[PDB]
Amino acid sequence: VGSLNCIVAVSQNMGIGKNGDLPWPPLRNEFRYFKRMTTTSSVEGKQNLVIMGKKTWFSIPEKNRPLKGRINLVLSRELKEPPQGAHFLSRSLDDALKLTEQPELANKVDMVWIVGGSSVYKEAMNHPGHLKLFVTRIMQDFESDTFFPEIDLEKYKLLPEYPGVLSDVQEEKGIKYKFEVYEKND
């Protein structure tokens, strides 16, 4: 299995969700960036694995589930089996990441992308080891009811370049945003 990564888009007030959807209106190219990053595998004959909480799964329009071209894993302790359309169910992050080591997935999975929500991001981010954060900074405040956890910049270095990530300010629907990549290893 290759690298471990989180990806998120977050407002200035650290918002990531409101009433089961995003705080901001649809940003088509920002969603396209999510799809390109999470789907693109560095490695022949492998796909990437996306790990998400149960509310995040059901927050994705059903027409777009499972996230195509990626192995979809949902985190839930209440569910008894993967939701309709999902591929795997795990009861904890550690369990998910261990599954990736099992014979079924061991040689199938390239990158692992944690795609939220808040609890899974916080655990991933505080877990020892080599981890990148792909963070889209939505450059306005938006009313939110779900927030991104604190990034500790003592450990997460903002990278001054990354191949394939545009460095200039984007704008869609009158909303400016910019892409960032953080890396720790502890």
Ligand X SMILES: NC(=O)C1=CN([C@@H]2O[C@H](COP(=O)(O)OP(=O)(O)OC[C@H]3O[C@@H](n4cnc5c(N)ncnc54)[C@H](OP(=O)(O)O)[C@@H]3O)[C@@H](O)[C@H]2O)C=CC1
Number of residues in contact with ligand X, rule: CB under 6 A? 29
Cα–Cα distance, 51 to 31 (Å, whole number)? 17
On the CB side of 167, CA atoms within 13 Å amount to 6
Q: Is 76 in the site for ligand X (CB under 6 A)?
A: yes
CB of 26 to ligand GHW, least distance (A): 8
Residues 100 and 88 sit within 8 Å (Cβ to Cβ): no
Residue 50, H or E segment = strand 47-53
Site string for ligand X, 127-166 (x = CB under 6 A): -------------------x--------------------
d(CA 138, CA 161): 19
Residue from 59, 84, 86 nearest 73 by CA? 86
- DSSP letters for 70-88: SEEEEE-SS-SSPPTT--E
Q: Which of 32, 91, 130, 176 binds ligand X (CB under 6 A)?
A: 91
Q: CA-CA distance, 164 to 166, in Å (whole number)? A: 6
Determine whether 171 is an active site residue.
no
Question: Helices in 16-117 by DSSP H: which ranges?
Answer: 28-39, 54-59, 93-99, 103-106
Minimum CB–partner distance for residue 51 and ligand X (Å): 9
Does 146 bind ligand GHW (CB under 6 A)? Our answer is no
- 5 interacts with ligand X by CB under 6 A: no
Enumerate residues 7-66 that contact ligand GHW by CB under 6 A: 7-9, 22, 30-32, 34-35, 56, 60-61, 64
Of ligand X, ligand GHW, none, which one does residue 64 interact with (CB within 5 to 8 Å by kind)? ligand GHW
Footprint of ligand X on this chain (CB under 6 A)? 8-9, 16-17, 20-22, 52-56, 59, 75-79, 91-93, 115-120, 123, 146
- Annotated catalytic residues are 22, 30
Footprint of ligand GHW on this chain (CB under 6 A)? 7-9, 22, 30-32, 34-35, 56, 60-61, 64, 67-68, 115-116, 136
